[PDB]
């Protein structure tokens, strides 16, 4: 007489993929693209005004800088251009819009080697 619950589809990347993928998958694409920056991003813990994307694994080149990003994730989630928007770094950063994603990797970037980003309002 068992009920058996299916496990939520939006769970984060780090509650996925475990620690051992996660390495060999950012090994795998440094091999390949070594200087492109395998970037997650994924919505903040909380938040409830903004969407779920269905991308949340984003391979960035190098000079790319924050604010392409931005004007990437905010046409992708089809936002109001009045509508505010944060990426953040670590769990609560905001970086300088002018900043090339890959100096925000070196210093940045989890033990798994992936940066990890989240979006927000508030």
Not at 69 to 94: C, D, E, G, W, Y
Request: include cysteine.
């Amino acid at each position: 007489g068992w009920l058996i619950i299916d496990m939520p589809s939006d769970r984060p990347f780090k509650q996925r993929r475990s620690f051992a993928d996660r390495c060999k998958e950012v090994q795998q694409i440094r091999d390949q693209h070594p200087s492109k920056i395998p970037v997650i991003i994924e919505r903040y813990k909380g938040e409830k005004q903004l969407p779920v994307l269905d991308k949340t694994k984003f391979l960035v080149p190098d000079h790319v800088n924050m604010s392409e990003l931005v004007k990437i994730i905010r046409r992708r989630l089809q936002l109001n251009p009045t509508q505010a928007f944060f990426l953040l770094v670590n769990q609560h950063s905001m970086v300088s819009v002018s900043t090339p994603i890959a100096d925000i990797y070196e210093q940045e970037k989890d033990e798994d080697g992936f940066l990890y980003m989240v979006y927000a309002s508030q």
